[PDB]
Design a protein around this ligand. Structure first.
Ligand SMILES: Nc1ncnc2c1ncn2[C@@H]1O[C@H](COP(=O)(O)OP(=O)(O)OP(=O)(O)O)[C@@H](O)[C@H]1O
Ligand SMILES: Nc1ncnc2c1ncn2[C@@H]1O[C@H](COP(=O)(O)OP(=O)(O)OP(=O)(O)O)[C@@H](O)[C@H]1O
Ligand SMILES: Nc1ncnc2c1ncn2[C@@H]1O[C@H](COP(=O)(O)OP(=O)(O)OP(=O)(O)O)[C@@H](O)[C@H]1O
Ligand SMILES: [K+]
Ligand SMILES: [K+]
Ligand SMILES: [K+]
Ligand SMILES: [Mg+2]
Ligand SMILES: [Mg+2]
Ligand SMILES: [Mg+2]
Lengths: 527, 527, 527
């Protein structure tokens, strides 16, 4: 029922391309080892300084709504890449801008932009197949350090710290980053618990900068079954309001109504509560719940044998933890002191249950519980002289951690944008079905040179010349833009995770090729 | 030294196309037998009503300068066609708009608009060759009446009057149009003299609607040689100021200084004077000069034998005429009374000199003098109840006269836009040198259907369907848009002059293909 | 006494670079065989369409005065190149923009821009020496046709016509361009006179579009000595005002006061007069004076023997010509009908005087008078369907004539911007005296790739890639941007005049490096 402005065709496409260009320019100045930082004004306090593509992308909104549409779509590209890999958002942004520009250029009366999108998707699938074919698994801790160093703007100490943490707690251990008060970075191993379930509702979030649910010294509520009555959760609320700890509850499903009462209690000032779902579904659920009960210290309500009721909640029957971190994906409970004698007894029980029988699937769960109570959660404490440098370095360490985890998940390819460059001959072996698919394949093939061009351009040299010298060289040679020479990139350690490259390409292509198909733009009149 | 606005590329091209579209729409509503009229506001008096393409074109100027640039270029198309043929300006306008639109559409990064212009010119030359190949000479007075009827919006009486005038004074006789006070049109022949020389300077023009130098009952001044002295033209000026009658002078070359004094005398209020150059260069010049001297009545100054001086100018030694019409191309004198006995004696002298000897080139000049004294100038007087109706009908009669003269000059082709339609297969036999020439040939081939489409669209039917039914028919069949059926156009008399068709195509192509090659538009900032 | 705005340093330099960039962008779109045209609005009539760099340059003035300063300086570059060579203004503009950009970039606190300008001059002198060392003379008419074809946007017929004219009247004959009424171009030689002297004062110009003094059928006044009295020029003025013909006077020096009276007579409406100076200084002056005296038909006033006075001026004692074109540099006296028997007698006198004695300097003057009266002035008549097309084609023909004349004057180098590219290794052999001279040499060496880059960029390909492939190829190989491949440029006829290249480089460098030295800009406040 609001009055709208309707634009058609090429002027609308150019207006969207203007917003795409502004956002991608501001993001693209941060690309590579010679990229620079962006200062973003914050309303509440000090401005933030970042070299992160998705942060710069999400911080820019435009007054002109036709430009803001393209800006929001490239924000979607950057945010989708950050969600799926945690790295490669600047690459995704420049690839999205390139595909948008080349798609907008090749639009005519007889052109079919939908079949151009089809050819773009076909070419991108071929490139992703070639990326998987040229990928290499990570087999050494030196490769781990190299990936973490490359992903952290060539910070050797950050990569060394990440490599040491992954050596101490395993390549699939839980590592988290928080801000340290001293000047130097440090790594500590403390006993920690993590399961891949988050909050049901995103209404409990307390910090706005971190956008998480962070709690210190919280009571742990356990309900193995469904919560029995309102007269069973209200005494728990009164005990939590009595004994000065907030309530973190672990349960099957708190979705409809008890979650609703917790939301309207959170709406009241000061009262803190958060809910997470069960990790497992079978016997592993009960085993992990008993592990958490022994590691916290208290009792369990909801069992079938002892019939302990939530109605008779008591301070000694609940577990106490140090710090609770709740996110969208996983829940962290940290520094939870229990009965250490009972923790050792449960460890003995687990390692004695190891030597009973083999079934090749239950032993994986029992050993992951063993590593849960055995290998501590690594904590990376980032140091600096002020909050701005700490936040910038924290972004870099988070990038390095995400990239290293993606590297052990999927493998590594050539860095410096050279993997996309070496995937160019794979597109030359495709035969398009019609002319519009040929246009799409050509768009993707011209787009595949953009990240190396941007990395070289940020170093102050001519990017197209560098890219031509890269494709003229052998397949192992690429441009080191830090030293400004042509090197064996694998030997020099300039490598990238395969997951990051393929997800940046896929998200950029998927959004930008759909944006290309537009003919009419409908916006709200600014009132 | 004036501040300018500079625009680049597609937005500038679209802004020019907007002015082209406005002017061509207003012109195109007047096309064909079912076209309508345009009312143009006039500052000095009553608004004018016209069905003439170049009048509507020249009457439109736009406030936006980027639109006004395209409007001025299509005005150039219409005015060039009117100057070269006097007919076919609406056709030239629609062809220019079509070529501008199709050229602006096929402009990309890799496209070369200059070679597209080259291909356009090649295709247009091929079409003009095919038009000449399919043309037919005019051999009958019925074809003359048919051409004059078609060119005057199907006015049978106008075409009959033009055919009767050309029957009485010859197909190459001089016919002029004026407006009569009575309601009926009337044709009459009395006398007349026309030679193809006009005024040297365009500063003597008295009427603004006709844009000509029209004089009633003027003196004839004759200087066979160059004018001797200021003391020879000043007594002529004083005698002209004495005997209540303006001065039309016939001479070799009045260009630099005496013409300048005549201009600054014309700047004074009331004083009327005009100058025209000699018709011939050889003995024909002296023979024609003696012919007007005998036909006007007086004497001649500037001869070698009698040595009559311009200094001793006398009232009885100068000729007197009835009306002088001076244009850019030819000078007209009408109703010039001389000594009719001496006129008959000069006629006897010419017809007796006819039977002396033959040289096949001097006898042509002798016989054209014979037709000068023999075949009088036909005058067409257009009637109506008011000035607006006679002005509209005068435009139609002028169109019909120009088209009939072009028809006897060059021939006739199929009317209704069917000649350009039948020239389409000639373009299919060309092989372009590159892709840009192919684009130009395709632009011209798509443009060749525009006049028949516009004629059919003005009749309220679907133009593209009509054009397809024309090209599916035999080469003699076209659409009569007046009766709304498909007929043998030659038998029904719907025919066109070949000159009109070929000049409309050539001017439209030549300007619009050059306009297509633009990338930057520089305009003045409106101050 | 007018209020001024004063700007310092970097923002002033950026503001000037903005105007430089705007003008150079608009000029640079027209470069090379795939360059496009610029449409310029004209106040009086139809807009003009041009591919000429200096026309686009001079047509752009900006409202912001800091931008308009840089725009006026690059206009100065383009106009100086046009004055010194008549071709290469787009190249001069892009080189000036490049030098201004690279000079503004390397300005710091410790940098000395004056010594950077010194290094720029040293580098440009080295490049010009290398251009002279790599040039070759023109020895064939096919090279003449090739240069004229390249300079006229690849128009084979224009180059063929220029080659035929230079074959018929000699490579140093006088050729001029005028617009023809027919559609096709034509060339004809009849007669003609030219000496390298123009008007003393630029006040008689009546052709506003051509910026020349164009006169038709003018009187020839001759004063071999100084003009005697006011009572000798006043009867000449009265005779000119008597015999309908304007006055072109040939004399020693009409500078102070008789020129002043001619100016105040020209201020009055209609009165036309123009003065030109003597061709020679010695006996050649008298010989040439008698030559146009015989070739015009009349007498001579001012001699020592016959004592003919200017006071007794007579109509039969003055010469009459066909057309007079007066320019800043030379005078065009065309179609002068003298006594052809006396012209033949003077030709016989000259050729019989030629067989008397040898002195190796006077015989050159005798033979140049012989070629003046024997080899006629060629005239090129440019055709088209409208005024805009003939104006664009006239610009191209004038470019081709100027380039061909410069080619026979100085020689030819490689086309396509490859000569400046091949002059790059000459700069690598220089040693700078300090760091600022090194900065200037580097600026010029980076600038030397700009014309080939712009030519390749206008064709829709990547310019830097093309320039690298040119520099890696053999010294004879360059990029044909019309066919889009790499060829022997000399064999394909893509060649340039050495004079055009060296004057474009010198004129760009001299102004742009001085503009680089600026620190403070003082402008007028807009009132
Ligand atoms: N020394 C180097 N030489 C060449 N390329 C390098 C070098 N160091 C890093 N790179 C490349 O830089 C890219 C990473 O750039 P950057 O970290 O600015 O952006 P990103 O990974 O796309 O996104 P995000 O903004 O999330 O960090 C990778 O392609 C990597 O291979
Ligand atoms: N009865 C008819 N049926 C079909 N076509 C017709 C008929 N009468 C005229 N025509 C066509 O109409 C066209 C002439 O239209 P019109 O007189 O409006 O414009 P024009 O000749 O292009 O320009 P101008 O404005 O100078 O008259 C010609 O192509 C002619 O063949
Ligand atoms: N087919 C071609 N291939 C490559 N280069 C070409 C070709 N034709 C012309 N050129 C180059 O184009 C340049 C001339 O371009 P252009 O005529 O637009 O500019 P200009 O001579 O600098 O200036 P202007 O003509 O505007 O006074 C020359 O360097 C010439 O060698
Ligand atoms: K980045
Ligand atoms: K019409
Ligand atoms: K040019
Ligand atoms: Mg990164
Ligand atoms: Mg008509
Ligand atoms: Mg040129």
């Amino acid at each position: 029922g609001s009055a709208k402005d309707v634009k058609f065709g090429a002027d609308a496409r150019a207006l969207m391309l203007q917003g795409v260009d502004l956002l991608a320019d501001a993001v693209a100045v941060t690309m590579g080892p010679k990229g620079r930082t962006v200062i973003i004004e914050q309303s509440w306090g000090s401005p933030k300084v970042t070299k992160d593509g998705v942060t710069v992308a999400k911080s820019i909104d435009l007054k002109d709504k036709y430009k803001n549409i393209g800006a929001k779509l490239v924000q979607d590209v950057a945010n989708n890449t950050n969600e799926e890999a945690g790295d490669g958002t600047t690459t995704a942004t420049v690839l999205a801008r390139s595909i948008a520009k080349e798609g907008f250029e090749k639009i005519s009366k007889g052109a079919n932009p939908v079949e151009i999108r089809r050819g773009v998707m076909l070419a991108v699938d071929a490139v992703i197949a070639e990326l998987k074919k040229q990928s290499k698994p990570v087999t050494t801790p030196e490769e781990i350090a190299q990936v973490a160093t490359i992903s952290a703007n060539g910070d050797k100490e950050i990569g060394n710290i990440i490599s040491d943490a992954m050596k101490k707690v395993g390549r699939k251990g839980v590592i988290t980053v928080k801000d340290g008060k001293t000047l130097n970075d440090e790594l500590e191993i403390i006993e920690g618990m993590k399961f891949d379930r988050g909050y049901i509702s995103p209404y409990f979030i307390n910090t706005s900068k971190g956008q998480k649910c962070e709690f210190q010294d919280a009571y742990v509520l356990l309900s193995e079954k469904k919560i029995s009555s309102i007269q069973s959760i209200v005494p728990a609320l009164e005990i939590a309001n009595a004994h000065r700890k907030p309530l973190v509850i672990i349960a099957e499903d708190v979705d409809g109504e008890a979650l609703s009462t917790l939301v309207l209690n959170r709406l009241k000032v000061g009262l803190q509560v958060v809910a997470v779902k069960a990790p497992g579904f079978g016997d592993n659920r009960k085993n992990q719940l008993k592990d958490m009960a022994i590691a916290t210290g208290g009792a369990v309500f909801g069992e079938e044998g002892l019939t302990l009721n939530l109605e008779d909640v008591q301070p000694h029957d609940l577990g106490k933890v140090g710090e609770v971190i709740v996110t969208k994906d996983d829940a962290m409970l940290l520094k939870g002191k229990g009965d250490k004698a009972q923790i050792e007894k449960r460890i003995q029980e687990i390692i004695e249950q190891l030597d009973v029988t083999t079934s090749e699937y239950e032993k994986e769960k029992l050993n992951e519980r063993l590593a849960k109570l055995s290998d501590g959660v690594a904590v990376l404490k980032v140091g600096g002289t002020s909050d701005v440098e700490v936040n910038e370095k924290k972004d870099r360490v988070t990038d390095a951690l995400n990239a290293t985890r993606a590297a052990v998940e999927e493998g590594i390819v050539l860095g410096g944008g050279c993997a996309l460059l070496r995937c160019i001959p794979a597109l030359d072996s495709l035969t398009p079905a019609n002319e519009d698919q040929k246009i799409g394949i050509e768009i993707i093939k011209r787009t595949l040179k953009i990240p190396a061009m941007t990395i070289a351009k940020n170093a102050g040299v001519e990017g197209s010349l560098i890219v031509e010298k890269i494709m003229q060289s052998s397949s192992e040679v690429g441009y080191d833009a830090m030293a400004g020479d042509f090197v064996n990139m694998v030997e020099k350690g300039i490598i990238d995770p395969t997951k990051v490259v393929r997800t940046a390409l896929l998200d950029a292509a998927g959004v930008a090729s759909l944006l290309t198909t537009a003919e009419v733009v409908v916006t709200e009149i600014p009132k």
